[PDB]
Amino acid sequence: QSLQDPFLNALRRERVPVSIYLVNGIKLQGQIESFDQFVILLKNTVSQMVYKHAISTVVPSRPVSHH
Amino acid sequence: QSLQDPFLNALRRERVPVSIYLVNGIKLQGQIESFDQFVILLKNTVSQMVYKHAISTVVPSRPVSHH
Amino acid sequence: QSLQDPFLNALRRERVPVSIYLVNGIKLQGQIESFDQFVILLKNTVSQMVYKHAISTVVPSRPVSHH
Amino acid sequence: QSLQDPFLNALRRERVPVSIYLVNGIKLQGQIESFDQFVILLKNTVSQMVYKHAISTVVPSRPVSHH
Amino acid sequence: QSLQDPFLNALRRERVPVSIYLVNGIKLQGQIESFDQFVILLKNTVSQMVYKHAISTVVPSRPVSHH
Amino acid sequence: QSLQDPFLNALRRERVPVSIYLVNGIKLQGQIESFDQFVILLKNTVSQMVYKHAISTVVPSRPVSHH
Numbered sequence: 001q002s003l004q005d006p007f008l009n010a011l012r013r014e015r016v017p018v019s020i021y022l023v024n025g026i027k028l029q030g031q032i033e034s035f036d037q038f039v040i041l042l043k044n045t046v047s048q049m050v051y052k053h054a055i056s057t058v059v060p061s062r063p064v065s066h067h
Numbered sequence: 068q069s070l071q072d073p074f075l076n077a078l079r080r081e082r083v084p085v086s087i088y089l090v091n092g093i094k095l096q097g098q099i100e101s102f103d104q105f106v107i108l109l110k111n112t113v114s115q116m117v118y119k120h121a122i123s124t125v126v127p128s129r130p131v132s133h134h
Numbered sequence: 135q136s137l138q139d140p141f142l143n144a145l146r147r148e149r150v151p152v153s154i155y156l157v158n159g160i161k162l163q164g165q166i167e168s169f170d171q172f173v174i175l176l177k178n179t180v181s182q183m184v185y186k187h188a189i190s191t192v193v194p195s196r197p198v199s200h201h
Numbered sequence: 202q203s204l205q206d207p208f209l210n211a212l213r214r215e216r217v218p219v220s221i222y223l224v225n226g227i228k229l230q231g232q233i234e235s236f237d238q239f240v241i242l243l244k245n246t247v248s249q250m251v252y253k254h255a256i257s258t259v260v261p262s263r264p265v266s267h268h
Numbered sequence: 269q270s271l272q273d274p275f276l277n278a279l280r281r282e283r284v285p286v287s288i289y290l291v292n293g294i295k296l297q298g299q300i301e302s303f304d305q306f307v308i309l310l311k312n313t314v315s316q317m318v319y320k321h322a323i324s325t326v327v328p329s330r331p332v333s334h335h
Numbered sequence: 336q337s338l339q340d341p342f343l344n345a346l347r348r349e350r351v352p353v354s355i356y357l358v359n360g361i362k363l364q365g366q367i368e369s370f371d372q373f374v375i376l377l378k379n380t381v382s383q384m385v386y387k388h389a390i391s392t393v394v395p396s397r398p399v400s401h402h
Binding site for chain 5: 204205208222224226253254256257258259261263264268
Binding site: 022023024026028034035036037038039041042045046047048049050051053054 | 336337338339342343356358359360387388390391392393394395396397398399402
């Protein structure tokens with residue numbers, strides 16, 4: 001595959017503001033600083049570590065290309 | 068098997084609008100752009116990346132065949 | 135084992151209407167069209183694909199035998 | 202190990218009414234008919250299949266011994 | 269490692285009353301009777317079996333040492 | 336990789352107060368005492384054991400460096 005890495009890499013490279021919705025409906029915002037297979041580092045005031053198992057959808061704030 | 072891939076492939080191929088309900092009850096809509104074993108790319112204004120672990124049911128907006 | 139397959143197979147074979155409760159408390163209804171180890175295809179108007187990780191309990195609408 | 206099997210086996214053998222609380226706070230009741238590593242069959246009017254990943258706690262309605 | 273076993277073992281040995289918060293926000297209380305890698309047996313009136321996948325945090329009711 | 340360990344190690348070393356949001360929206364606070372791949376020990380009055388599967392995001396109360 002796989003689809004995650006190029007999607008997230010594009011967001012990180014272009015420094016696209018994103019909305020990350022968590023499995024509880026709470027929305028987080030910022031720019032994807034780095035990621036691996038378990039977490040995303042989400043930046044603005046501080047870097048916060050978001051567990052992928054808690055994420056429902058990642059929504060870019062503007063159209064982003066990759067594949 | 069397996070049932071997922073042909074179901075999602077049919078939706079993607081026929082460009083069938085779908086409703087994706089997440090484990091928190093929130094409903095997402097659009098067309099399935101691509102998928103793998105971990106995420107679905109869901110399109111309309113922007114492509115958003117939906118984690119399969121956060122999805123409860125995928126509901127096509129009209130009858131779709133595959134198997 | 136295992137208990138899942140004969141329980142779900144019986145429901146599918148006898149075309150027993152079932153209630154599927156999801157981990158968020160939302161109830162889905164219909165007849166089990168097919169399943170594997172990851173999803174259930176639940177039919178009535180359209181087939182919808184239900185992720186087993188999102189299901190809490192499967193409730194037949196009438197007594198069903200298998201084992 | 203392991204602790205699950207003797208606890209659930211005792212409940213099943215003694216036909217002890219149990220309360221099964223699901224991860225969403227909904228309470229189910231009945232007697233444990235059978236189980237494996239993925240589901241519990243919970244009986245009263247009909248047998249319902251409860252996914253262990255959706256269960257939070259199993260509460261016997263009276264003191265039960267095993268180990 | 270690992271951190272779980274000595275933390276839970278200390279609680280069990282010292283028979284420290286604990287609060288177990290579940291992933292849905294519901295609080296359970298009692299003393300940890302036994303545990304393994306999948307469940308905790310939580311005692312007071314009856315022993316109840318708590319699935320670790322449903323637990324969010326284990327809060328001792330008083331300071332407990334181990335490591 | 337991997338990103339978790341250096342992020343959490345920095346927080347633990349610098350004894351940075353953190354907010355840990357759980358998958359249910361409840362916020363926990365304190366200082367990260369120790370962690371492994373399954374839990375975080377979160378300190379203030381008592382040490383509490385937080386299951387990583389129940390955590391959504393870890394938010395430092397001030398900017399923290401590592402990588």
